[PDB]
């Protein structure tokens, strides 16, 4: 199927790390990216997570969803996917600090929303949506990144050690299966929030175990006034509705997609009123 021989891949550089491995800019029929386990051993739990990763990536074929080229089991096990130009969205927000005009930002949101709708359509919970996952291929297009703990319905909860994007009900961990589409929706809302505030959520909160408690008990909430001054009001209300602490009132992804499409249809692309252009 997508098996990959060990010798062919030409690993180049350690770009970064995270999520059960480290990323290399391999070379297999042009630019790729390889997620690789640092430890050589085939630990059964990480092996099973790898198998689930393979299956879920094989379940997806969308344009805005990372293109899983293959999985190699020989030597240290790895996943080879498309190399994405530019770094992740987290870098483009809080490391590059490149400005995003509201047109571009809403486009990014629309694309990634289409991606999430695709994952949900084939009955997959991403379970790990963040800003480190979103990748910005050139031309302002978007791809949803790793799906390491993303799984199908299968009708296990792991902190995955990623706070500020996890949902409060996911944090609370009462029913032993608190992973729903609305959890992914709340992750989406958090991504929108950090896109439209310019910083990470809950800036005033500092300590990690402080912020987990503050968002968990619900004492703390994202400060909507911290958003950009210049942004469409419908988008603001959509962010607020998507970040609702209560699960059932967060919007399912087709509805948020419809709202975003309405926003696109009512997008003031140019703040100034352009007149007669210089002919030809």
């Amino acid at each position: 199927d997508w098996e990959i021989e060990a010798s062919e891949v030409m690993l180049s550089t350690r770009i970064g790390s995270g999520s059960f491995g480290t990323v290399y800019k391999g070379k297999w029929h042009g630019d790729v990216a390889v997620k690789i386990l640092k430890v050589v051993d085939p630990t059964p739990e990480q092996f099973q997570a790898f198998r689930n990763e393979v299956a879920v990536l094989r379940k997806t074929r969308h344009v805005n969803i990372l293109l899983f080229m293959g999985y190699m089991t020989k030597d240290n096990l790895a996943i080879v996917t498309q190399w994405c130009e530019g770094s992740s969205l987290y870098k483009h927000l809080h490391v590059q600090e490149t400005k995003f005009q509201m047109f571009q930002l809403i486009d990014i949101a629309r694309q990634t929303a289409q991606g999430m709708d695709y994952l949900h359509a084939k009955n997959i919970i991403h379970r790990d949506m963040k800003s480190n996952n979103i990748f910005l291929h050139e031309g302002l297009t978007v791809k949803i990144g790793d799906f390491g703990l993303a799984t199908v319905k299968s009708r296990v909860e792991q902190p995955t050690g990623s706070v500020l994007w996890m949902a409060p009900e996911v944090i609370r961990m009462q029913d032993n299966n608190p992973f729903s589409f609305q959890s992914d929706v709340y992750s989406y809302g958090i991504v929108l929030y950090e896109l439209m505030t310019g910083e990470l959520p809950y800036s005033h909160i500092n300590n990690r175990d402080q912020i987990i408690f503050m968002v968990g008990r619900g004492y703390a909430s994202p400060d909507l006034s911290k958003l950009y001054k210049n942004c469409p009001k419908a988008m603001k209300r959509l962010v607020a509705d998507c970040v609702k602490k209560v699960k059932e009132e967060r919007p399912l992804f087709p509805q948020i997609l419809s709202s975003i499409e309405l926003l696109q249809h009512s997008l003031p692309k140019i703040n100034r009123s352009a007149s007669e252009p210089s002919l030809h």
């Binding site: 970064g16 790390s17 987290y90 870098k91 809080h94 490391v95 600090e97 902190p159 995955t160 050690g161 990623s162 706070v163 500020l164 944090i171 609370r172 961990m173 990470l200 005033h204 909160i205 500092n206 300590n207 990690r208 175990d209 402080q210 912020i211 987990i212 408690f213 968990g216 008990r217 004492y219």
Partner: protein
């Protein structure tokens, strides 16, 4: 000047010794993506940590930014940390605990009197004893920008953390003192302070993070049994562990404790008990 070039890996946060100085050295490869402008700030305060030395504090060496990572230049320790040594040895007697308590107390007071900054985190894995028997507590919350980067980080399996500094943004040194009291209790018992376990386990000597935090904030801090701990020791550690900051053991009444005097007067060679554990 210091760099990662003259760094020879030995063992394991990697244990990578210094080449030219001949000193076995340790690097902390805690890395994540930050704005480089923020990254400017971290080195200068680490220099201040280098210019301060205490007989109960880790060896400090100038840190630096490598090719995409933040490394820390700390001293070697065959004792490693407290977590694995307690895991191998099981439990710890009163004398060793008291000597560790005075070590950490005077180290944090040294911090509070020299660097004018609080610990901002205390953890038994951050407690560690030299191979020759010296407690060399390290990795303080000295640098604000590092703590800011660590805001976006993993989830703590057992956040030995003061509930008052959790719930309310009004925080004080007494909160770190409560944290260190909890660390002392944990190293005494040998397990996370879950509600008191079976009398079987006490006679012998998986839970989610958020509900553990709820237990800490709501339920009283765990008590210390008198059948395995001296009355003064448990009483004083409980006093240090009270949730109300009014009766929290401030530094002065921390040194006031009689068991502090017993630990000062007693003779416990950490090297001997370590070799017995080693």
């Amino acid at each position: 000047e210091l760099k990662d070039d003259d760094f020879e890996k030995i063992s394991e946060v990697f244990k990578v010794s210094h080449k030219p100085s001949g000193l076995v050295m340790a690097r902390k490869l805690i890395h994540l993506e930050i704005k480089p402008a923020i990254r400017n700030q971290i080195i200068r305060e680490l220099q201040v940590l280098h210019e301060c030395n205490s007989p109960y504090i880790v060896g400090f060496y100038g840190a630096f930014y490598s090719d995409g990572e933040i490394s820390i230049c700390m001293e070697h320790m065959d004792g490693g940390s407290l977590d694995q040594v307690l895991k191998k040895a099981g439990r710890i007697p009163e004398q060793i605990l008291g000597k560790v308590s005075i070590a950490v107390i005077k180290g944090l007071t040294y911090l509070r009197e020299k660097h004018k900054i609080m610990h901002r985190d205390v953890k038994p894995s951050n407690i560690l004893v030299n191979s020759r028997g010296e407690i060399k507590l390290c990795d303080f919350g000295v640098s604000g920008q590092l703590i800011d980067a660590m805001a976006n980080a993993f989830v703590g399996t057992r956040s030995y953390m003061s509930p008052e500094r959790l719930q309310g943004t009004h925080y004080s040194v007494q909160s770190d003192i409560w944290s260190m009291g909890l660390s002392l209790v944990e190293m005494a018992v040998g397990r996370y302070p879950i509600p008191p376990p079976d009398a079987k386990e006490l006679e012998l000597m998986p839970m989610a993070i958020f509900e553990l935090l709820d237990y800490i904030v709501n339920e009283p801090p765990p008590k210390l049994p008198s059948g395995v701990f001296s009355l003064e020791f448990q009483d004083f550690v409980n006093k240090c562990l009270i949730k109300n900051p009014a009766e929290r053991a401030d530094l002065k009444q921390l040194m006031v404790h009689a068991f502090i005097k017993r630990s000062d007067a007693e003779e416990v060679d950490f090297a001997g008990w370590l070799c017995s554990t080693i």
